[PDB]
């Protein structure tokens, strides 16, 4: 019995120093935290994309203003994800192909669809599209962002006022160093540069101590595994099985690099690009003077040399001189994220391809659930079981959503895209698609107030993947309901007054397009 006195974090990556900062802040003055980190071969900064709650749920919790960490991490702004060439056959190219008299792209923006007479705007859009009253795509009809993103507009005016929900693009290595300084200098976290040599467990299977290569022994009451894919504690020591979920996600490898960019000549894109490839997809994360890019592919349909060739040719890079990072990740999650006195945080717990910018979210979302379910020395099993339940739902819901990107793509030109259609959706995901086809919303938000959504982590965590996200991806790829929502035929006044709702989006599209500065213009004044 007694409270947790000492906490040992194994691993000093991005997740490791987020755990040290979050736990150091949450338990300030009531727990001694030590982080074990061994020097590894450093890698390139291939870029990271995030979601709006990174500020409200993480940096706000630490008490760090957005401007403070943005300037020290050379971060850019992210307004949406631009899905390129997901509906047209062809090689992997950065240029959008032609589809129905226009470029093959669609946006997944932040925020929530507006409610009109208790019904999301998506249902009103499809009702018009189904009956031939409109041909405008879903994203351009219901969101104001696509128009200003086509012109690389900034999410904030020169006076600082924000006109849309946005996230950030940055190099994870810089944020890790920023949080390393914050945790050690402000929160009293102890940093130890050593390599784990032996993990000693007791008769109950719990971790007793960790011995390093130099002979130092570190004991604690609670151990946090941030060692990445290796899982030194949760997998190696605790012997907890890892659940491979490649029966839903075929991608398991990646080739990534960083490419210099002339922001003065071309501006900066306020969005992440997800460019469909022949055996996967390639991300593009614009930053300051450069952009990170990585080809996520499936080793079952493309060899590493084929992926390196495809990746370099699309960006006009020299495969013999370009610095490249070749990665082979494990897709899935542990059977239990928390076992005994060992809590897994980061890629040691779970991993999925960064198609929807969930990597960093998984860290501080798990850290949020860890503090909410924080135990004492008795390690109450109810706290551990409920934490493991939240983590498995957080990941499995994301896994199902990511699979829908490939499962519902109309492409059939390569074995990769054809095989994705041969996989089976999870029962929870298949039920969601059944609702969608019936004209229902999928996890409709309780309110269309984005400030409440992104300002209340509990409100968002219970409704992380909401109707707005599903319609952006499903309707963007071409999946639409079999027929309009049957209740709209009983709402003649609602379907008539909705004209002003679509007109309001058109007016904001025109006004913001004409008045907003470019992202490059704002970044220049922002970053000095």
Q: How far is CA 181 from CA 226, 329, 345, in A?
A: 18, 29, 20
- List the catalytic residue out of 25, 78, 114, 144: 78
* Site membership for a second copy, residue 380 (CB under 8 A): yes
Rg, C-alpha atoms of the chain:
23
Rounded distance, CA 97 to CA 53, Å?
A: 33
Could you tell me the smallest distance in angstroms from the CB atom of residue 442 to a second copy? 11
Shorter beta-carbon distance to ligand BTR: residue 77 or 464: 464
- What are the distances in angstroms from CA 299 to CA 249, 252, 363? 12, 6, 27
Q: Known binder of ligand: residue 356?
A: yes
- Rule CB under 6 A: choose which of 21, 227, 282, 358 binds ligand BTR: 358
Strand partners, 350: 333
Other CB atoms within a 10 A radius of the CB of residue 186 amount to 15
Three-state DSSP class for residue 519: helix
26 sits near a second copy (criterion: CB under 8 A): yes
Residue 188 C-beta: closest distance to ligand BTR, Å? 32
The residues facing 328 across adjacent strands are 253
String of DSSP letters for 434-471: HHHHTT--SS--S-S-HHHHHH-HHHHHTTSS-HHHHH
| 310: its two tokens | 């495809």
When CB distances are held under 5 to 8 angstroms depending on the partner's kind, the choice from a second copy, ligand BTR, none that residue 63 binds is none
Asked whether 50 and 360 are in contact (CB, 8 A), the reply is: yes
Residue 295 marked as a ligand binder: no
Judged by CB under 8 A, which of 318, 490, 496, 528 binds a second copy? 490
Q: Determine if residue 276 is labeled as part of a ligand binding site.
A: no
| CA nearest to 256, candidates 294, 227, 312 | 294
**Binding to ligand BTR in span 52-81, by CB under 6 A:** 52, 80-81
Q: Which of 281, 464, 470, 522 binds ligand BTR (CB under 6 A)?
A: 464
Cβ-based burial of 75 (10 A; exposed 0-12, middle 13-18, buried ≥19): buried
Q: Is 302 helix (H, G, I), strand (E, B) or coil?
A: coil
Q: Which of 329, 346, 350 is nearest to 13 (CA)?
A: 346
Q: Which is nearer to ligand BTR, 315 or 465 (CB)?
A: 465
Among 130-138, 142-150, 461-469, 515-523, which window interacts with ligand BTR (CB under 6 A)?
461-469
| Numbers of helices and strands, H then E, in the chain | 20, 26
Sign of CA dihedral 136, 405, 153, 515: positive
- Is 14 annotated as belonging to a binding site? yes
The residues, ordered by sequence, that sit 6+ positions from 140 with a Cβ below 8 Å of its Cβ are: 146, 147
Q: Is 393 annotated as a binding residue?
A: no
Beta strand pairing call for 222-225 and 272-276: unpaired
What 3-state DSSP class applies to 320?
coil
Q: Which is nearer to a second copy, 325 or 443 (CB)?
A: 443
Residue 3 bears catalytic tag: no
Residue 356 beta carbon to ligand BTR: minimum distance, rounded to whole angstroms: 4
Using the rule CB under 6 A, give the single segment among 136-144, 192-200, 253-261, 459-467 that binds ligand BTR.
459-467
* Residue 305 CB, nearest approach to a second copy (Å): 46
Select the residue interacting with a second copy from 447, 451, 497, 515 (CB under 8 A).
447
Which of a second copy, ligand BTR, none has residue 380 at its interface (CB below 5 to 8 Å by kind)?
a second copy
Q: Does 286 bind a second copy (CB under 8 A)?
A: no
Q: Is 269 in the site for ligand BTR (CB under 6 A)?
A: no
Q: Does 428 participate in binding a second copy (rule CB under 8 A)?
A: no
SS3 300: coil
Q: Pick from 298, 469, 485, 526: which binds ligand BTR (CB under 6 A)?
A: 469
91 binds a second copy (CB under 8 A): no
Host H or E run for residue 249 = none
Q: Taking CB under 6 A as the rule, does residue 359 contact ligand BTR?
A: no
Stretch that binds ligand BTR, among 237-245, 282-290, 435-443, 458-466 (CB under 6 A): 458-466
Report the catalytic residues.
78
> Which spans of this chain sit near a second copy (rule: CB under 8 A)?
3-4, 26-27, 29-31, 371-376, 380, 382-383, 386, 434-435, 437-438, 440, 444, 446-447, 452, 456, 458-459, 462, 483, 486-487, 489-492
Q: Which residues are annotated as a binding site for L-tryptophan?
A: 356, 453-454, 460, 464
> Which spans of this chain sit near ligand BTR (rule: CB under 6 A)?
51-52, 80-81, 108, 110, 356-358, 460, 464-465, 469
């Amino acid at each position: 019995s007694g409270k947790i006195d000492k906490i040992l974090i194994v691993g000093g990556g991005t997740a490791g120093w987020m755990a040290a900062s979050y736990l150091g802040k949450a338990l300030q003055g009531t727990a001694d935290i030590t982080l074990l980190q061994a020097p590894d071969i450093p890698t390139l900064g291939v870029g990271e994309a995030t979601i709006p709650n990174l500020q409200t749920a993480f940096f706000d919790f630490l008490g760090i203003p957005e401007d403070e960490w943005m300037r020290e991490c050379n971060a850019s702004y992210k307004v949406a994800i631009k899905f390129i060439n997901w509906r047209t056959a062809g090689e992997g190219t950065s240029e959008a192909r032609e589809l129905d008299g226009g470029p093959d792209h669609f946006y997944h923006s932040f925020g929530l669809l507006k409610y009109h007479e208790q019904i999301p705007l998506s249902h009103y859009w499809f009702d018009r599209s189904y009956r031939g009253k409109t041909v405008e795509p879903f994203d351009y009809a219901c969101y104001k962002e696509p128009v200003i993103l086509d012109a690389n507009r900034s999410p904030r005016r020169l006076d600082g006022s924000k006109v849309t929900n946005y996230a950030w693009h940055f190099d994870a290595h810089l944020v890790a160093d920023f949080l390393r300084r914050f945790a050690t200098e402000k929160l009293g976290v102890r940093h130890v540069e050593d390599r784990v040599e032996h993990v000693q467990r007791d008769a109950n299977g719990n971790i007793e101590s960790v011995r390093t290569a130099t002979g130092r022994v570190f004991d604690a009451d609670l151990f946090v595994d941030c060692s990445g894919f290796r899982g030194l504690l949760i997998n190696k020591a605790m012997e907890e099985p890892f659940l491979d979920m490649s029966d839903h996600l075929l991608n398991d490898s990646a080739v990534a690099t960083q490419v210099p960019h002339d922001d003065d000549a071309n501006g900066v894109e306020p969005f992440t690009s997800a460019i469909a490839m022949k055996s996967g997809w390639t991300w593009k994360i614009p930053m300051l003077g450069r952009f990170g890019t990585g080809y996520v592919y499936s080793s079952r349909f493309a060899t590493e040399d084929e992926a390196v060739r495809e990746f370099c040719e699309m960006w006009h890079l020299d495969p013999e001189t370009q610095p490249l990072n070749r990665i082979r990740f494990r897709v899935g999650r542990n059977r239990r994220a928390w076992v005994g006195n060992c809590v897994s945080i980061g890629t040691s717990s779970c991993f999925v391809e960064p198609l929807e910018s969930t990597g960093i979210y998984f860290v501080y979302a798990a850290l949020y659930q860890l503090v909410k379910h924080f135990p004492d020395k008795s390690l109450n099993p109810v706290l551990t079981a409920r934490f493991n339940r939240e983590i498995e739902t957080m990941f499995d819901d994301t896994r199902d959503f990511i699979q829908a990107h490939f499962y519902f793509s109309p492409r059939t030109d390569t074995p990769f895209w054809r095989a994705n259609k041969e996989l089976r959706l999870a029962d929870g995901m298949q039920e969601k698609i059944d609702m969608y086809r019936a004209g229902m919303a999928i996890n409709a938000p309780a309110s269309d107030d984005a400030q409440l959504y992104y300002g209340n982590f509990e409100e968002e965590f219970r409704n992380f993947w909401n109707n707005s996200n599903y319609y952006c991806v499903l309707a963007g790829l071409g999946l639409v309901p079999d027929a309009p929502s049957p209740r709209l035929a009983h709402m003649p006044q609602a379907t008539e007054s909705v004209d002003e709702v679509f007109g309001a989006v058109k007016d904001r599209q025109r006004n913001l397009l004409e008045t907003l500065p470019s992202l490059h213009e704002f970044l220049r004044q922002q970053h000095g």
